[PDB]
Design a protein around this ligand. Structure first.
Ligand SMILES: NC(=O)c1ccc[n+]([C@@H]2O[C@H](COP(=O)([O-])OP(=O)(O)OC[C@H]3O[C@@H](n4cnc5c(N)ncnc54)[C@H](O)[C@@H]3O)[C@@H](O)[C@H]2O)c1
Ligand SMILES: NC(=O)c1ccc[n+]([C@@H]2O[C@H](COP(=O)([O-])OP(=O)(O)OC[C@H]3O[C@@H](n4cnc5c(N)ncnc54)[C@H](O)[C@@H]3O)[C@@H](O)[C@H]2O)c1
Lengths: 278, 278
């Protein structure tokens, strides 16, 4: 591994390249992006050594390790092109926020080269300009092996993520989507809706946006995330997202009934759930 | 003003007391609390000059300025006792998180002496041992005067808060509970529900609490008892807020169910802009 290729040189792609370099990688870091400015900026910042917007020129880089960091919706089309360009011994992995069937689709396109991944490290910022060289430190990184996953490549990807500080753990592609549908997608949905609530509950008399405190702002900081990306995530993992919103509403409606009936003792018990050493 | 009585010598009661001294107060600061330890520690810490665990004893302090800093549930019971202990020349104000009906009930019991208040500060900490002498510096303070409110007492209480760095503004008792019912209570109710959700959506193959980096960390250190009281005291507004919230969340859910790709991005874009302007 001496030629790494960053596909999609934005916040995540750039953060991975910076982290890899800072961890001591001495090989070449190349970039591929459809946006010319992305490539230019990354080269200026020293995030990548060289880049291009022409997929065909990538063969000139002879990549042995590819990190898919563009929007998930672009993976399949990009993977098909890489299948003709990349040597069979190369390794291709990703940072996509969703896994599920995507993983099997990429395996069918790329064969043994593919290893699905998702670093649990977020941001509300976009673009390579905001890239960080320690973004993954202490953050979990979910790799999603399947029966067909290549043992050696999985081990390699794990080591690379550990080299940048990730806390690697494995989940099937399906389990990943369920888990994060509840622990990440649902919370984001709740944050978006909480902000939307203040829009509708404000009156020509009072503008609720004038009174948000810390509890409110902390809970809604993720509502500043990229709209296009979350529109994508919500649709890409819609089955689990629908189930998670439904489950949440079941819990909220239970709290609601406790409040309406003024069930003092049970209400306290419900609220005490927020304790637990876990 | 010269005989200050802190009712409920905890984090808030203690903070007001300390904020009082730093501001240059040279008079006497007394305390009343049902807990012996609260008084003893407060005295050693130089928080208060002297205190008692017997409400009757208060007359020995002949307080002319009282700051209710105990649980809101205790206000009505304490006020009734104070009505025949305090002289008609005394001023009584509070720190309760809720106003609304509480303000009118306190006025009916204490008369022209009562002035409702709510400092928007305090990191939820509990115990006079955590009180600070700057907790209000720059923070907002909501006073809820009514038609029966005494202009002289209102101005007094206002100046005092400002003397401890507070930024005062006025709201009717009902508007206060509506606003905070949506911007504070609802957000907390939502978090309690999220916790219940992770508990019930966890399965034998996964403990959802092990993954807080996906946005769940935003959502605690709260007090189950305090919130049980707040949810009871502000039941109507909290119920309306939850219903308002579910309308926003269901609108979002629907955009996902039918995959309205463009409308979803617009929904998220608007919320992002609104959250940024906060
Ligand atoms: N934003 C986050 O916090 C976060 C966290 C975990 C995972 N992810 C995942 O990683 C992806 C990227 O996130 P980001 O924040 O870096 O986005 P970004 O907008 O900062 O960067 C995305 C890059 O993708 C490029 N791109 C778009 N289409 C392309 C194509 N067809 N070929 C090559 N490049 C293309 C863009 O030009 C841009 O430089 C997301 O799609 C998401 O699934 C994001
Ligand atoms: N905690 C916060 O961040 C915060 C913020 C704004 C307003 N408030 C309000 O301030 C008040 C106190 O908050 P805190 O955080 O200091 O709580 P705390 O637990 O630190 O202190 C409460 C005190 O009340 C005493 N107490 C209980 N019953 C009493 C009674 N019948 N008579 C006299 N004392 C009694 C306790 O012994 C304790 O010392 C509450 O009414 C709350 O609504 C709290």
């Amino acid at each position: 591994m001496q030629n790494v290729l960053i596909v999609g040189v934005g916040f995540m792609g750039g953060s991975f390249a910076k982290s890899l370099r800072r961890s001591g990688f001495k090989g070449k870091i190349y970039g591929y992006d459809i946006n010319p400015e992305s490539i230019s900026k990354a080269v200026d910042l020293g995030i990548i050594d060289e880049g291009t917007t022409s997929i065909a020129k990538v063969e000139d880089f002879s990549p042995d390790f590819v990190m898919l960091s563009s929007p998930v919706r672009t993976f399949r089309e990009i993977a098909k092109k890489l299948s003709y360009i990349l040597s069979e011994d190369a390794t291709v992995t990703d940072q996509g926020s969703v896994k599920g069937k995507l993983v099997y689709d990429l395996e069918n396109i790329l064969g043994k080269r593919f290893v699905g991944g998702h670093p649990i490290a977020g941001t509300e910022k976009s673009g390579v300009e905001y890239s960080l060289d320690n973004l993954y430190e202490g953050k979990k990184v979910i790799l999603t092996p399947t029966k067909k996953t290549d043992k050696k490549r999985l081990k390699l990807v794990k080591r690379v993520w550990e080299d940048v500080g990730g806390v690697v753990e494995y989940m099937s592609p399906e389990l990943h989507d369920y888990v994060f549908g509840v622990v990440s997608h649902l919370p984001h949905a709740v944050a978006f809706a909480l902000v939307d609530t203040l829009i509708h509950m404000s009156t020509p008399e009072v503008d609720l946006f004038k009174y948000p405190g810390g509890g409110f702002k902390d809970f809604t900081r993720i509502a500043k995330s990229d709209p296009i990306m979350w529109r994508d995530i919500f649709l890409e993992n819609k089955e689990n997202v629908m189930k998670a919103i439904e489950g949440f509403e079941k819990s909220l409606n239970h709290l609601k009934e406790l409040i309406v009936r003024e069930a003092e003792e049970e209400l306290v018990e419900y609220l005490k759930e927020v304790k637990i050493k876990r």
